[PDB]
Amino acid sequence: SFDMNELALKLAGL
Amino acid sequence: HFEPVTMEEDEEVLYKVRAKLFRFDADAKEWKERGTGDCKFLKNKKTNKVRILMRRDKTLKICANHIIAPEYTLKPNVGSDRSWVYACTADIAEGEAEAFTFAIRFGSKENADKFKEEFEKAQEINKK
Amino acid sequence: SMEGILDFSNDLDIALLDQVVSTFYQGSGVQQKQAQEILTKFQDNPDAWQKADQILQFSTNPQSKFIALSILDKLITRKWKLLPNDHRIGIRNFVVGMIISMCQDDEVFKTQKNLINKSDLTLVQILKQEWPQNWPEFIPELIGSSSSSVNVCENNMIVLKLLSEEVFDFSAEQMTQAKALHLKNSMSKEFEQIFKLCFQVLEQGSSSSLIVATLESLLRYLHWIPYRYIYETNILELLSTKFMTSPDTRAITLKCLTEVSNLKIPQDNDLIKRQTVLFFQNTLQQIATSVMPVTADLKATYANANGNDQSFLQDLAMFLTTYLARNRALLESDESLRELLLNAHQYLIQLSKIEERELFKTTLDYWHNLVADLFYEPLKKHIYEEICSQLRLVIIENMVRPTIQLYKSEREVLVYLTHLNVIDTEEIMISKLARQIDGSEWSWHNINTLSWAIGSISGTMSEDTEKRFVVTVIKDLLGLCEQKRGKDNKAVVASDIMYVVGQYPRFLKAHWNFLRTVILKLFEFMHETHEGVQDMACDTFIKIVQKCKYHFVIQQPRESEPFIQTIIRDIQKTTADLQPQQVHTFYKACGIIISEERSVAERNRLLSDLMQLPNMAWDTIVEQSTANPTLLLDSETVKIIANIIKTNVAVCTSMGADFYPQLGHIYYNMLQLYRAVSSMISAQVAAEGLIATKTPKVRGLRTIKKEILKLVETYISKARNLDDVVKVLVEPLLNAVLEDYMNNVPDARDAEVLNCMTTVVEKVGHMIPQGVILILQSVFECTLDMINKDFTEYPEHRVEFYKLLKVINEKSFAAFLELPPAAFKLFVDAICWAFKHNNRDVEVNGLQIALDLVKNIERMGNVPFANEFHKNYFFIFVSETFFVLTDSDHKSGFSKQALLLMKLISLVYDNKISVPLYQEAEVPQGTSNQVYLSQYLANMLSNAFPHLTSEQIASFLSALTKQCKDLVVFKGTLRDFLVQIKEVGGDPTDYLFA
Amino acid sequence: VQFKLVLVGDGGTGKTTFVKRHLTGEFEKKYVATLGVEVHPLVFHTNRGPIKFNVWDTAGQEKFGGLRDGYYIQAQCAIIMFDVTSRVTYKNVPNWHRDLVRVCENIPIVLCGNKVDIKDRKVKAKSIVFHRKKNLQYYDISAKSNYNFEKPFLWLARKLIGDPNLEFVAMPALAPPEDPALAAQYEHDLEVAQTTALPDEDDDL
Ligand SMILES: Nc1nc2c(ncn2[C@@H]2O[C@H](COP(=O)(O)OP(=O)(O)NP(=O)(O)O)[C@@H](O)[C@H]2O)c(=O)[nH]1
Ligand SMILES: [Mg+2]
């Protein structure tokens, strides 16, 4: 449903 | 110790749907809007009678108030698949119980069919 | 029985009049309505003014006397100069004497303000007629009578107020230029005496009602008087101190000072600069000591709405913003004026916190003026650091949903505030974001507001700090979403996360992997049935694509293919739960990406794969609907077809010229479908009547036709290859739509046909002369007959009709030359018919077509067609243009009417019409069109406006014709004419103004 | 507890249509010009009891002007109406305001820009500022879509009563009540009604 974990992931790298 | 510093409560909502209500001006052969807002099926807890109560947005003025009589019959309108037309013999939205030919329209055919379903269920409740 | 007063043969029964009036104002229902119709008939009686002296004398009812003055007002305004000279003096003496007696009776003066104000206005109307040429001693005697009585003095201030208004504020429309200049000069020549009276009253006190009436008149003076009366006197001192302390005079004084901040002032004089600083210093001082200190919570004061607090805070805002927008530089250099400068702006900060949208817009306009100046002007921004820091919070907290107008204004000021100090802006926003997480200020409204604000300052920072900031904002927003339980709270926060990222494309473009994750997550939301999420996902998708399309079409590193391919491969799965409209947005967004691929072979391949689903659905329907056509009766098939076309429109909208390959795939079968659907609509109207057009089945069918037309219109309007448009698209199009339109009954004709043809003629009309003729033959006469019976029926057809004629007249005027004379006569009738519309959409085009037609005929030179046109239609266009110019029902078209008329008159006075415009018998030979034109117009105006003198008509035409090379002057002369026809005895010399 | 409201503005701005919407709930499509004035009682139910507006819907066309400013006498509040699709109607606002405040020197006044439901808006929001110096409340409204249609009366109610917290509340809903000689009568009217198509079938509701 609402789970932005992948966004947190890709942002924590960069 | 320190000293410190609508008449709808007796009813239950069976069905609620957004709609636009029309009344037929026979002398002009023309439909006229009466109100747009939430249309509710309200069951009295002390009589089990179901009515339609509809209020206009913002002003909250009643634009429909009548018993869902078992004798009424929902008819399709020629120019709509999301509306129902039916005769009402006693509506008190604006004072005395007056007779009206009503038409009520909804956002979709789905809402209209569901309205018809609930409308008929309500009639059988009033039948008892 | 109430109708007795309407019998003028007998004496007027004042008692009966007073009853009818009372029944109207204090009565109700039927009786009130009946009395109303009687009073109107009485007032509108042309002889009623004669009985005005009786009413004003004998009546005890103030409403009856008011109505009597209204009857007199009409008489003075329109028929004054027609009266015998005796009656003019009688009315004047009667009105003067009446006002005097009302002022002497303190009871009357106290309780009948409306009747006295009405009388004063009535006096001013006499003045506009009589003063000063027939009443030179009015002002001297007015000043004399003031000293005798406070009531008379006070009332004289009301008369002078009204006079100043009628002459300087409301004269432009209501009197001629000459007459206006006359009264302006007259007031200007005697103001020296008037001001002396006004200043003495203000300085000597002491009746507040007298003072307030004097200040009210002063407000009107400040609109036009020379600045010397304000600066070379002590009057600024009085306003900025004495009159700011009393609440009775505070409101009006503040408005006066607001206008003083707008006076014409020499900005090189240092003494005047001092004065300008002084009265501001004094005003802010009185406010701090008498009204409220700079720390006061004006938000709470305004909300309480005690007395006139709201009006006062509104007027204070207007005063501060007006003065500071002009003069703040006077306060920025002197160190001793710094406190005054910042205190003034601190009041504005407090004022900007008030919850009142229109007031906020007023302060926000000023803030914009300030921060814009600090952004360019050197050495200024450091002065306002504390003010600007507070403003950041104020704007962030009151940020509205992107009225969009107010959002743009808010964004603009906040972008400036971000440049002025980036670090402070970041700190405030992150601070606010932390208070959302600790729940101290958590709210659906408050988290949205903050997200809009954070998103508004996009592309103002450094790419590096922007990145650092965005990461901080998102990372913290991400944590906020976990914190909340229930999909209600989670949906709100998640949407704000998608909003912010969609606002920072520069960030998304630089970090592909993150951008890719964002998009895949939007596709997940396209399956969420929670209200608004699907719309939010689709809106964000296309929003991101518009800004990052290049990163979807190229093969990014660590990828085997361009991402656009990946989107298409799963497009069925992605859009499976979406509504039709949402699916169309998805496809349109794909079209945006595809159009960036500059490889033609690749672009067309991507287009084919994108349109795979609708093209298979299409192919299947076309195959089974053609055998047999019964399938179209099914509502589902009609809906499916309409959606397919709508999908083609959506993709064609973003791809334009590049859509052509896909159009060719469906074009010929699509036009066949248009024919099949058309037959069914006709068949239904035949079998059920016109009511059939209201039924869902036919409305469903007509939707198909309209979407087909929209698709073709959309492509042609954006086509780069016009050869193909002409040689492949146009002929089948015209064969499919024109005859169907012509041979349908009126209520079955789609106005979209006209609009489509307008687009065709626009782009390729110069290349299809035979086509344009065919269009006119098929739509002109039958559409005109739909709309030439009233201004009401068939509004869509009406608007598109004149758009079509307009573009045809521009692009292929030759089509009108081929018209038979009778049809060309209808064309002219149609153009004039457009003049008479109040409808803006129709009127403007009508006037433009007429103007362009005249130019078309002119360019033909001395040829038989042009000469015949003038002989037939010149005076028709002149008289028809004049009619709408003067009938007072088409004032919204004055400019274009004026232009058209100026063009028509110039033709004759430049001798562009080679043939005589008159019958060889009705005028002697050798007579120039110029002479005959004067005669025609003189005769025309004489019969149309018989109350005008021959000299008026002659002077007007003499001025009009000689000024037909100067539009602004020409229009001036027309305005003067429109004034003179409203009255009797206008001055012919007025037309010599220019 | 009733207040006189004068409604002024250019012809065709939707003054009469607006009042009708509040009276019966209908939307009149036809433009039948008002002759002089029409008085209509209009009651709202608030938390501070009922408030009654005696609305004087005046004529905007000059040839139908009637008593003109005679209608303004002893008005306690007013609405100035213009049409955001017609610049001239906004140009004339200062003129209506002028004639109004000369009779009614101190009353709450609402300035309404009607017909914001129409796409091709001509009088842009940034251009509407006349109300600022004249201390008029301003509202974008639409009689057709009911956008902000209640705001002018709510604001005026708050001003006239002197309670900024005044709100519109739901009126009480009484229980509704429950012959063969009219069986064929109502069956006639019903059949005529079914065959008469409902208006605005493209509307969202
Ligand atoms: N699209 C749209 N039309 C409106 C709106 N309000 C009124 N109209 C239309 O405007 C036209 C004029 O309406 P009307 O109430 O008679 O205006 P009026 O100001 O009372 N005219 P008058 O001053 O002559 O009495 C009508 O056709 C009406 O349907 C609106 O909000 N939106
Ligand atoms: Mg009207």
Residue numbers in the entry:
A (entry chain D): 6 to 19
B (entry chain B): 64 to 68, 78 to 200
C (entry chain C): 0 to 376, 414 to 438, 461 to 1052
D (entry chain A): 9 to 186, 190 to 216
Authors' description from the paper:
The exportin CRM1 (Chromosome Region Maintenance 1 protein; also known as exportin 1 or XPO1) is the most prominent nuclear export receptor in the cell. The NES-binding groove of CRM1, which is wide at one end and narrow at the other end, consists of 5 hydrophobic pockets P0–P4 and is virtually identical in all CRM1-NES structures.
To more rigorously test the idea that position of the ΦXΦ motif is critical for determining NES orientation, we flipped the C-terminal ΦXΦ (LDI) of PKINES (SNELALKLAGLDI) to the N-terminus of the peptide while preserving the sequence of the NES helix of wild-type PKINES. We named the new peptides PKINES-Flip and three variations were designed. PKINES-Flip1 has the inverted wild-type LDI at the N-terminus, giving sequence IDLNELALKLAGL. The two hydrophobic side chains in the N-terminal Φ-X-Φ were incrementally made larger to generate PKINES-Flip2 (FDLNELALKLAGL) and PKINES-Flip3 (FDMNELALKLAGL) mutants. We solved the structure of PKINES-Flip3 bound to CRM1 at 2.5 Å resolution and it indeed binds in the minus direction. These results show that NES binding in the minus vs plus direction is determined by placement of the ΦXΦ pattern at the N- or C-terminal end of the NES peptide. A C-terminal ΦXΦ motif that follows a helix dictates a plus NES, while an N-terminal ΦXΦ followed by a helix results in a minus NES.
